[PDB]
A paper describes a structure:
In this study, we characterized a thermostable endochitinase (Chi23) that can hydrolyze both crystalline and colloidal chitin. Chi23, from a marine bacterium Pseudoalteromonas aurantia DSM6057, is a member of the subfamily B of the GH18 family. However, different from other modular endochitinases of the subfamily B, Chi23 is a single-domain enzyme containing only a catalytic domain. The catalytic domains (CaD) of GH18 chitinases adopt the classical (β/α)8 TIM-barrel fold with a conserved catalytic DxDxE motif.
The crystal of Chi23 belongs to the P121 space group with four molecules loosely packed per asymmetric unit. Gel filtration analysis showed that Chi23 presents as monomers in solution. Chi23 comprises 14 α-helices and 10 β-sheets. The catalytic 113DxDxE117 motif is located in the loop between β6 and α5, and a hydrogen bond is formed between the catalytic residues Asp115 and Glu117. For Chi23, it only has such an α-helix, and lacks the β-sheets for the formation of a β-hairpin subdomain. Therefore, different from other bacterial chitinases from the GH18 subfamily B, Chi23 does not have a β-hairpin subdomain. However, similar to PPL2, Chi23 only has extremely short loops in these corresponding regions. Moreover, surface residues Phe30-Ser44 in Chi23 form two antiparallel β-sheets, which are conserved in nearly all eukaryotic chitinases of the GH18 subfamily B, but not in the bacterial chitinases of this subfamily where only one or no corresponding β-sheet is formed. A detailed structural analysis of Chi23 showed that the side chain of Asp229 forms four hydrogen bonds with the solvent-exposed residues Thr226 and Ser264, and that the side chain of Gln261 is hydrogen bonded to residues Ser10 and Asn9 lining on the substrate cleft surface.
Residue numbers in the entry: 2 to 278
The structure:
């Protein structure tokens, strides 16, 4: 199983992650400028400017990588507009080249596609979101081959519900799941999954059985603290004993993701979770 975290807030120095039991750190975020959607800009504690990492970030990445940890840039995030994606969907190869260049020029291990434009799975966004994610994944994987590079996505549970109205990622995994390393499923901000372990477990198992998916390719994601999500916080003892152990009893568990690194005091959360894996 793998342990994954997102780094957006800088309240805890990034280099602290190099001494904690994380396998993957997603730097959040790279996203479209309001100006021109094909110009990608950085946000969060990683950014010295819109186009550059801070000095401390650059060093922390090297130290993490020396430890055998993988560091991805997360593209997207919750604040990226559907209108920017609509434009990008008309030239995914150009977007892929920009992302691949950012990964290579900053010596990263790949990309996390944190895509949250739900309306593009319901016919309300003026572009086909599933075909966008399918094409973007193919073009990115062309430029960032396995197994040297990682491509993850971060879907929300409705995206993966067979037969659902917003199940865009069912189509995604059916067409290009073999090219995706794993899914960081956000079991938060999404009723009725939020803080509902029984529903999280049954859905997790269903997702591992989608075409091209497996336990290894599905990571269960949670907020560290109450302030990390509008809904879905659960104490770590509940995650362990009502999510992790029930999944381990029936299948295997690809891993645990959290939002977000700087909310975890002294790394206690990841230490307890890791232990349980």
């Amino acid at each position: 199983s793998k342990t994954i975290t997102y780094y957006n807030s800088g309240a805890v120095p990034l280099i602290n992650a190099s001494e904690l039991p994380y396998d993957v750190v997603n730097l959040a975020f790279l996203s479209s400028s309001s100006n021109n959607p094909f110009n990608l800009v950085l946000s969060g504690a990683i950014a010295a400017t819109e186009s550059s990492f801070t000095t401390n970030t650059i060093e922390a990445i090297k130290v993490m990588q020396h430890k055998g940890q993988k560091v991805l840039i997360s593209f997207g995030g919750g604040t990226m507009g559907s209108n920017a994606y609509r434009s990008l969907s008309e030239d995914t190869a150009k977007l892929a080249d920009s992302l691949a260049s950012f990964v290579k020029n900053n010596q990263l291990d790949g990309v996390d596609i944190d895509y949250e434009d739900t309306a593009a799975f319901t016919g309300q966004a003026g572009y086909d979101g599933a075909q966008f994610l399918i094409s973007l994944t193919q073009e990115l994987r062309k430029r960032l081959p396995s197994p040297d590079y990682i491509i993850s996505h971060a879907p929300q549970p409705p995206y993966l519900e067979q037969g659902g109205y917003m199940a865009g990622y069912v189509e995604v995994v059916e067409l290009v799941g073999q090219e995706i390393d794993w899914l960081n499923v956000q079991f938060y901000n999404n009723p009725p999954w939020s803080a509902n372990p029984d529903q999280i477990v049954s859905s997790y198992l269903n997702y591992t059985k989608l075409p091209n998916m497996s336990p290894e390719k599905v990571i269960a994601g949670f907020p560290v603290t109450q302030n990390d999500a509008g809904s879905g916080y659960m104490p770590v003892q509940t995650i362990i004993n009502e999510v992790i152990k029930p999944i381990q009893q029936q299948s295997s568990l690809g891993g645990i993701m959290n939002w977000q690194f700087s909310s975890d005091h002294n790394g206690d959360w990841i230490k307890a979770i890791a232990q349980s894996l």
